[PDB]
């Protein structure tokens, strides 16, 4: 159960940072009628090379090869995610000043609240992104109090 997968989290968080010295921000498992899919978001550096995923997956799989208190075998999903992150905290927005983010704010336009812009600078609640919508350039201050949903976005 959840307690069990947490126990696996502590036991296998050792390797991750004695192997690739990564840290798992979490391990979560999804299942659809088969060995469930334990997505372990491995961190360390942000721009994780694919090799830095292959070798890390080798390490973690070998670690759990002899370690599986959970009776059945399961899919290890070794994830080395990028910077893309849901922006709940203000620091989440502060780190992302480099990269574009998209937010859903209490005042939408055209029915839906979700809009993507590319941050130029950090200004507390106010936003000076080069938000680009409909091929339109502008720095639009999106009030965070309006923001019902906010996530850091892909850079493309």
């Amino acid at each position: 159960m959840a307690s069990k997968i947490t126990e696996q989290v502590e036991v296998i968080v050792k390797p991750i940072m004695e192997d690739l010295n990564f840290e798992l921000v979490d391990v979560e498992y999804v299942k659809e009628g088969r060995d469930h899919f334990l997505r372990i978001s491995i961190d360390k550096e942000g721009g994780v090379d694919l090799n830095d995923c292959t070798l890390a997956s080798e390490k973690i799989s070998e670690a759990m090869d002899a370690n599986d208190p959970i009776p059945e075998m399961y899919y290890l999903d070794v994830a080395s995610p990028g910077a893309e992150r849901p922006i709940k905290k203000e620091q989440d927005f502060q780190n992302a000043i480099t990269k574009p983010v998209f937010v859903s704010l209490y005042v939408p336009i055209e029915g839906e609240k979700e809009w993507l812009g590319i941050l130029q600078e950090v200004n507390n609640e106010t936003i000076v992104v080069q938000v680009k919508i409909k091929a339109r350039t502008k720095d639009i201050e999106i009030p965070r109090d309006k923001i019902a949903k906010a996530r850091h976005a892909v850079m493309i």
């Binding site: 659809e32 060995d35 899919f37 942000g46 721009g47 994780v48 090379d49 694919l50 090799n51 995923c53 292959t54 890390a56 997956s57 080798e58 799989s61 075998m73 899919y75 290890l76 999903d77 070794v78 994830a79 080395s80 995610p81 990028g82 910077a83 893309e84 091929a135 892909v154 850079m155 493309i156």
Partner: protein
């Protein structure tokens, strides 16, 4: 069926749906108009890369990555092939292909011409694998 009911009916076929949702650029970059472009290729980036593990006995560790093409539509896609030099948020070309590794995915990257560079040590990449004739 009877001739009359045959007449007042089309006898419709069982026409399929393309299991490859290959909606290429079409009108994505104006008006965001959905357009069934059948392009064999769009340019686009894999914002994240990953690696799910296969089960035993063939522990053939397969690696995935989530990608956005010219239409920028989310999908987790596996990488085939040996050797690469790309990373997170690298531009990649993905071809349509469903393999025995994992469900939830029906496409595949191609090697040789973009950030996921192929290897020119073999001779099979003489006309393919993105790499030139091994000379």
């Amino acid at each position: 069926p009877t001739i009359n009911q045959l007449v007042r009916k089309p006898r419709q076929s069982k026409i399929k749906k393309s299991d490859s949702p290959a909606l290429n650029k079409g009108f994505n970059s104006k008006k965001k108009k959905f357009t069934d472009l059948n392009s064999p290729q769009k340019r686009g980036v894999c914002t994240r890369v990953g690696t799910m593990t296969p089960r035993k006995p063939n522990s053939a560790l397969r690696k995935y990555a989530r990608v956005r093409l010219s239409n920028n539509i989310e999908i987790n896609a596996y990488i085939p092939g040996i050797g690469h030099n790309l990373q997170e948020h690298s531009v990649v070309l993905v071809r349509g292909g469903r393999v025995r590794d994992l469900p939830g995915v029906r496409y595949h990257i191609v090697r040789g011409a973009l950030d996921t560079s192929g290897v020119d040590g073999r001779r099979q990449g003489r006309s393919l694998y993105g790499t030139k004739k091994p000379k």
